Design a protein around this ligand. Structure first.
Ligand SMILES: CC(=O)OCC1=C(C(=O)O)N2C(=O)[C@@H](NC(=O)Cc3cccs3)[C@H]2SC1
Length: 159
């Protein structure tokens, strides 16, 4: 992958909003969203968040992420991590996580990145582990069906 990145733009929203393929994928990346996902839901997140970034390869937006929490000199928390269904497992998430780590360090002076990952998302848990994130706590949350899920709260120092 020759990958690049830039801030998210209005024109990207329809593409990015197409990434979650089912209600599980949507919950894992945006638990407050309601299925079906929409550009309006995506735009609302962007508005209340920081750092919304896309990853681009060969003219295609393949990934998106942002911060749902940010505390200058302290940390950021990565949110809305979405990857195009045709580009899963190819390094887009790894790439964007690296981008977001740099952004947290440089723009927020963060010492730590937090990532919270739902228990059912094994692929996320494994990736973040491979990227040097360590599990710190488990919180109870509830899915759209009112079922109890475990949110695994991980972090990583940035340097
Ligand atoms: C890496 C990634 O994509 O994380 C998605 C996520 C988000 C998100 O929306 O970006 N999060 C938030 O905004 C947090 N939300 C909660 O802990 C509240 C919840 C209520 C019901 C279930 S979780 C975390 S819960 C995890």
């Amino acid at each position: 992958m020759q990958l690049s990145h830039r801030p998210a733009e209005t024109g990207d929203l329809e593409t990015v909003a197409g990434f979650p393929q089912d209600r599980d994928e949507l919950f894992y990346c945006y638990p407050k969203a309601i299925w079906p996902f929409s550009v309006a839901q995506l735009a609302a997140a962007i508005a209340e968040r920081r750092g919304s970034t896309v990853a681009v390869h060969d003219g295609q937006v393949l990934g998106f992420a942002n911060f749902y929490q940010w505390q200058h000199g302290d940390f950021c928390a990565l949110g809305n991590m979405m990857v195009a269904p045709a580009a899963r497992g190819l390094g887009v998430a790894r790439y964007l996580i690296g981008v977001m780590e740099n952004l947290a360090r440089e723009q927020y002076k963060a010492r730590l990145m937090k990532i919270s990952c739902f228990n059912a998302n094994a692929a996320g848990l494994l990736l973040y582990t491979q990227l040097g994130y360590q599990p710190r706590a488990i919180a109870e949350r509830h899915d759209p069906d009112g079922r109890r899920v475990a949110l695994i709260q991980m972090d990583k120092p940035l340097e």
